[PDB]
Design a protein around this nucleic acid. Structure first.
Ligand code: MG
Ligand code: MG
Ligand code: MG
Ligand code: MG
Ligand code: MG
Ligand code: MG
Ligand code: MG
Ligand code: MG
Ligand code: MG
Lengths: 190, 130, 199, 291, 171, 106
RNA sequence: CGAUGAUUUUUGCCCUGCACAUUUUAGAUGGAUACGAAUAAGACUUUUUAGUCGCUGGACCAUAGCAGGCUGGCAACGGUGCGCUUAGCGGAAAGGCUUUGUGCGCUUGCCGGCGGAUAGCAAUGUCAACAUGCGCGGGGAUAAAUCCUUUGCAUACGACUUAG
RNA sequence: CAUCGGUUUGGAGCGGCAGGAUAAUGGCGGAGGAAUGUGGCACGGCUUCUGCUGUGUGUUAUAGCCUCUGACGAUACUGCCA
């Protein structure tokens, strides 16, 4: 239909300074800085004031309009990543074989080392992404805490850990073992 | 602060001065579609034209109501003095200089070359000591 | 529209077939053409689609003897060359001469690194494709199908751009000094007359 | 129609054409990839195949039925006197592949390597490398200039070394000269190493250690023209077949109306270039050792 | 096509029984008067026991636009044939002439429904006086107050094959 | 004084032809700087010279000329049709011709 | 396609400064006039708020003088050609891009004096870069391969590995 | 090269005449009306009210528009020019 104009309004909290130049967003907050390139989308930005930014698509068709609120949401996730952080909690689910999860360091790199998953002799290693912190929860038994400023990196590490512990050649309705994301929140509770 | 770099586009709006045929000025009085507008001007015929056939200029005729008739457009054009504003820009000046160059004769081109030689002599003399 | 001795085209951002057709008509009409930076050429369509097309091309080989079949060249310049040669009557002597009028390169090797590169607006990707469409860079398509010298070209292209930037900074400085000298000789008798002539 | 029964193809299509090697000296197609952090060292050596022998060895392979038990194994002896370094070549990375930039030679080359450059040595004035030997006149700045060019532009440095074939029992007097790539260290380190080793001998114990796995580049044994039965291992035809049986019965279907490149045909067998990998070094012997 | 709006008036041929038959008028959008009179007889034989042989064309006149430089919104009622059946539809167009909206309609049903000129009946063309008469959002979006929009990514046409400067798309 | 040219540069592009049949009696000429039939109509009737070199000297000169004239425009992009006294040989496709400024009508 | 060794004691070969004459041309006829990157973006000034530039190269450089002759003056101490000469950078196919001093010219930056006719009213009206040969001049260097015999790491014959 | 005759392709060609709704428009005048409501007025969010702006009201005010119409004056288009 070629909608003449579609708009979205970013909301910038008090301590945050968004910074956009040629579709390269640099969001700065108390918790650090996050950057994102949006050069694959045709959008324009207008600073209404220090607390609002207009995101506009001119003469966009259905899909190009659809790509507008996703731009808004990505920048909003950047904003809330540098002011509240992100925290994904993973629970260790096993029927018989305890899952032995350690945070090891080999070759100067951090790894999450899963052992004894379903009794297997194989040792699973998941590389920890830059800017992402892993921790074995003390307050909860069999819990892994994935935290960081970037929601994408945090959720992708959580997904890596969950996906590497898939059950093969069994009825997965019966063999429910694995490591699953149980809580998706923020570092700073609200 | 936020420091957001904004686009400096020219907008299709009532009051935009446009070039038609790279010669004559006109103003947008009402928008028909994404592709078509209604243009009017003192020295042009009021017509429906496609935005591809015209070029938006950086000049806006302020406070022109939508759908204004020829008399209103002419009166407001004379008041805002759009012709003088256009003629003072580098765009119109380059167009005028192109026309003036296109009207030179062979003798005038010879004179241009001679004067260019003199000016180049002076320019090199100034340049070598500075 | 002028007849040039050599037209050196900077191939960056050009659509493969449109540039190929324009260059074909240029070299058929007796014009010498050099295309540099063939690794920066573009094909419309996503990378996977063009890679599938190149794999369809690779399927084709002479059954009874693979050495007789089509010779699938992997370099970006040779991909452009195949596109151009398909648009030339290359099996005549005239087509052979026209093809002798053409040169294609990856990067910008000497002596063209210190010459003028032009663009062809009728074949430029940024001016031709609808702003949302997906495209391929021929340099990435070439590496995915066997071209071995991608990283060599980019190392040599960064060295060339560092040298070309020193050129421009020097050239810009002398342009600034000459402009200051032309400002001094303004409002002179020769300058005032030249302003009335349009110069 | 399809084959009545399935069978694998006879022979490998990855070793075509089954033609004679262009040279008798096997050439290193690929050298080990260079790691800068390692010390400067050679990556290859030239030797002469002496013969085969037998050893006895205690096997150390836990879980094997021969573990801690003696095995009798075939072994090959390669006569390897030290090679002499006589030159150095610089290679430049280009969008068309490696390109040799400059070759710098040593001042003095022995007669056995200067015979390499002659087809009729006995009828010659033996003028090879005499003007080049004059290039070293009292300052040798031409040589230093070429070496500096190699240091400035080369990314791959290879040394030129020849065998001392006079120390072998062979009656051939031509040495074998080959390029051996230098790995380890910077390009400047490689060039300095090559220069300081000009006219020096390099031994095998500086290239290969015991228990190493090494590759062997050689041209195999020539057998001349051979029929399909032994060239490709095809099945012999029945005893009662007219005009002979050491053939391939069907060399093709009607279409394609050509003989395909994948059909076994009679031709030259052996004398091929081969690269054979993973040969364990049981012994790096010393010529001075009487045991 | 390139069309004109015609007033075509015709009647049955007078008989001694009926010496003044009724005059029927139609508004026809045709490229010329030969097709205008052809389309007239096409629709009368869809509506009345008349033929070109038993009838008479009385008048053919061009109907010019009343305000050809006033921007309007038109509603067009259509009856078109698809590959499978016959459908009624209603669409809206923005233009300054009544004829130019019908020309856009013919391009539009060619593009969106593969409906050829022969497959289309124009039931009615109405200028929508009130902004509340506008039902379709693709023309209602141009009736908002203080409408502005840029034209991003301008492509400039060059007279020459080769250009010595980098291309740009500002505007 | 570095330039002495009094003709416009041209190129012999083609014969008059359909897809498969060519007509050597008509040549297609591209005049340099001409991009429209309006521009090309300045050159109608002008004389064209194809200047070439030959092995044998004639009166001490190895330079021979085939003369022609512009007859009409061709297409929409400023090519013209030319008529030479002897047909231009097909080997000259892409060779440069000289578009003379006479017969002058300025 | 590259690197490298040696290149005929023959009046043969190489390099080089000319001079002349020739063969050829897929086609000279002022100049292939060098950032990079983005394109829902670039670049100036203040201030990051805002204003300005583009909207094509119909540009830029060069362009006057018997295809450009012979002479004089003024103003400047510049521009340009050639020859030596200084230093630096360039290996992707660098073979080019700068640069120092010096000498000889020209200079249309400005103003002078003399010459061109008859090619007849047009006739490409002949003006270029590449190559080769030939005369001189100046330097420079002073081989191999094949056949043949031999070998057997090779082999139908050629070819191959050796030795002489 | 000139002029002529035959054929033919053109020009950013120029002028005169006719027709139509004796074009429709537009401009000028009169009458009526409305909103995507100008000024004003009344409430507001950010503005030292710095095209400030939003929502209501109503009908030209400190912008205008639509419809009908009265007397003129053109142009487009299509034809004709021996
Ligand atoms: Mg399963
Ligand atoms: Mg099971
Ligand atoms: Mg391969
Ligand atoms: Mg046998
Ligand atoms: Mg039998
Ligand atoms: Mg068989
Ligand atoms: Mg006539
Ligand atoms: Mg009226
Ligand atoms: Mg007419």
């Amino acid at each position: 239909m070629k909608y003449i104009q579609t708009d979205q309004i970013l909301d910038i909290p008090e301590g945050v300074t968004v910074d956009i130049k040629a579709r390269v967003v640099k969001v700065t907050g108390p918790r650090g800085e996050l950057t994102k390139d949006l050069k694959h989308i045709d959008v324009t930005f207008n600073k209404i004031n220090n607390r609002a930014i207009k995101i506009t698509v001119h003469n966009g068709d259905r899909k190009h309009v659809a790509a507008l609120r996703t731009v808004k949401s990505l920048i909003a996730n950047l904003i809330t990543g540098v002011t509240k952080g992100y925290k994904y909690k993973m629970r260790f689910v096993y029927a018989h074989f305890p899952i032995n999860v350690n945070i090891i360091k080999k070759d100067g790199q951090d790894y999450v080392e899963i052992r004894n998953f379903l009794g297997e002799k194989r040792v699973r290693e998941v590389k920890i992404h830059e800017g992402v912190t892993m921790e074995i929860s003390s307050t909860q038994k069999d819990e892994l805490i994935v935290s960081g400023n970037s929601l994408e990196a945090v959720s992708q590490n959580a997904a890596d850990i969950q996906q590497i512990c898939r059950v093969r050649n069994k009825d997965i309705r019966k063999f429910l073992d694995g490591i699953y994301v149980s809580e998706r929140g923020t570092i700073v509770e609200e | 602060s936020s420091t957001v770099k904004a686009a400096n586009w020219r907008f299709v709006e009532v009051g935009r001065v446009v070039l038609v045929d790279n010669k004559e000025l006109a103003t947008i009085v009402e928008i028909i579609d994404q592709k078509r507008v209604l243009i009017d001007g003192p020295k042009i015929q009021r017509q429906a034209i496609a935005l591809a056939k015209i070029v938006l200029t950086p000049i806006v005729l302020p406070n022109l109501p939508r759908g204004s008739r020829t008399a209103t457009v002419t009166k407001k054009w004379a008041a805002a003095d759009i012709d003088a504003k256009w003629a003072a820009s580098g765009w119109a000046k380059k167009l005028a200089n192109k026309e003036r160059r296109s009207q030179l004769s062979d003798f005038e081109r010879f004179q241009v070359m001679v004067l260019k030689k003199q000016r180049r002599f002076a320019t090199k003399k100034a340049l070598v000591k500075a | 529209s002028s007849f040039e001795k050599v037209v050196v085209i900077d191939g960056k951002g050009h659509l493969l077939g449109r540039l190929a057709s324009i260059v074909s008509k240029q070299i058929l009409n007796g014009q010498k053409v050099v295309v540099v930076r063939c690794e920066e050429l573009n094909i419309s369509g996503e990378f996977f689609r063009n890679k599938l097309k190149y794999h369809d091309y690779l399927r084709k080989a002479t059954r009874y003897n693979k050495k007789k079949g089509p010779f699938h060249f992997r370099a970006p310049s040779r991909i452009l060359y195949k596109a151009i040669r398909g648009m030339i009557p290359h099996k005549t002597a005239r087509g052979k001469a026209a093809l002798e009028r053409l040169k294609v390169f990856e990067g910008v090797p000497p002596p063209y690194d210190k010459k003028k590169r032009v663009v062809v607006p009728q074949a430029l990707r940024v001016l031709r494709l609808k702003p949302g469409r997906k495209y391929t860079t021929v340099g990435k398509l070439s590496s995915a199908v066997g071209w071995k010298y991608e990283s060599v070209v980019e190392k040599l292209e960064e060295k060339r751009k560092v040298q070309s930037a020193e050129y421009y900074a020097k050239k810009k400085a002398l342009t600034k000094k000459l402009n200051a000298a032309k400002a001094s000789t303004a409002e002179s008798e020769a300058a005032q007359k030249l302003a009335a002539f349009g110069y | 129609s399809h084959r009545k029964y399935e069978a694998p193809r006879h022979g490998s299509l990855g070793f075509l054409p089954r033609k004679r090697a262009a040279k008798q000296r096997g050439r290193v197609k690929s050298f080990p990839k260079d790691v800068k952090s390692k010390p400067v060292a050679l990556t290859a050596f030239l030797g002469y195949k002496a013969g085969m022998t037998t050893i006895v060895r205690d096997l150390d392979r836990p879980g094997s039925k021969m573990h801690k038990r003696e095995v009798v194994e075939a072994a090959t002896v390669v006569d390897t006197p030290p090679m002499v370094v006589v030159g150095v070549v610089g290679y430049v990375e280009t969008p068309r592949g490696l390109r040799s930039l400059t070759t710098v030679w040593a001042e003095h080359l022995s007669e056995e390597v200067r015979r390499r450059f002659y087809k009729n040595w006995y009828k010659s004035k033996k003028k090879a490398f005499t003007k080049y030997s004059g290039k070293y006149a009292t300052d040798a700045k031409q040589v230093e200039t070429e070496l500096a060019r190699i240091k400035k532009y080369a990314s791959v440095v290879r040394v030129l070394a020849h065998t001392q074939i006079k120390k072998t029992p062979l009656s051939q007097k031509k040495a074998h000269l080959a390029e051996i790539q230098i790995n380890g260290g910077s390009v400047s380190d490689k060039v300095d190493w090559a220069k300081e080793h000009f006219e020096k001998e390099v031994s095998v114990d500086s290239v290969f250690e015991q228990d190493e796995m090494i590759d062997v580049i050689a041209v195999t044994k020539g057998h001349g023209f051979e029929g399909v039965t032994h060239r490709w291992g095809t099945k012999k035809l029945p005893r009662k077949t007219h005009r002979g049986l050491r053939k391939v019965a069907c060399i093709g279907a009607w279409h394609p109306a050509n003989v395909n490149w994948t059909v076994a045909r009679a031709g030259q067998n052996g004398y091929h270039h081969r690269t054979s990998i993973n040969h364990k070094v049981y012994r790096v012997g010393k010529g001075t050792d009487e045991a | 096509s390139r069309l004109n709006e015609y007033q075509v008036i015709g009647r049955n041929l007078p008989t001694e029984s009926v010496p003044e038959p009724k005059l029927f008028r139609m508004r026809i959008f045709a490229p010329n008067t030969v097709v205008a009179k052809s389309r007239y007889w096409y629709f009368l034989q869809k509506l009345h026991k008349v033929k070109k042989a038993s009838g008479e064309i009385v008048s053919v006149n061009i109907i010019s636009e009343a305000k050809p430089t006033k921007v309007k919104t038109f509603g067009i009622w259509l009856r078109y044939e698809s590959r499978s059946g016959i459908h009624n539809m209603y669409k809206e167009y923005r233009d300054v002439t009544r004829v130019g909206a019908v020309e856009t309609m013919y391009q539009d049903l060619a593009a969106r429904h593969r409906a050829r000129f022969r497959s289309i009946h124009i039931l009615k063309v109405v200028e929508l006086e009130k902004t509340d008469d506008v039902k379709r959002q693709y023309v209602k979006q141009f009736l908002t107050k203080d409408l502005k929009f840029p034209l991003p990514h301008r492509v400039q046409k060059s007279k020459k094959l080769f250009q010595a400067t980098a291309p740009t798309t500002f505007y | 004084a570095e330039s002495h040219r009094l003709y416009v540069k041209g190129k012999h592009i083609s014969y008059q032809r359909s897809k498969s049949v060519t007509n050597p009696n008509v040549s297609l000429i591209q005049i340099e700087g001409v991009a429209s039939p309006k521009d090309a109509k300045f050159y109608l009737g002008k004389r064209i010279a194809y200047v070439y070199r030959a092995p044998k000297e004639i009166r001490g000169s190895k330079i021979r000329v085939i003369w022609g004239k512009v007859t009409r425009t061709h297409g929409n992009n400023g090519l013209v049709r030319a008529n030479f006294k002897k047909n231009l040989p097909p080997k000259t496709f892409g060779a440069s011709v000289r578009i003379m400024l006479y017969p002058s009508n300025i």
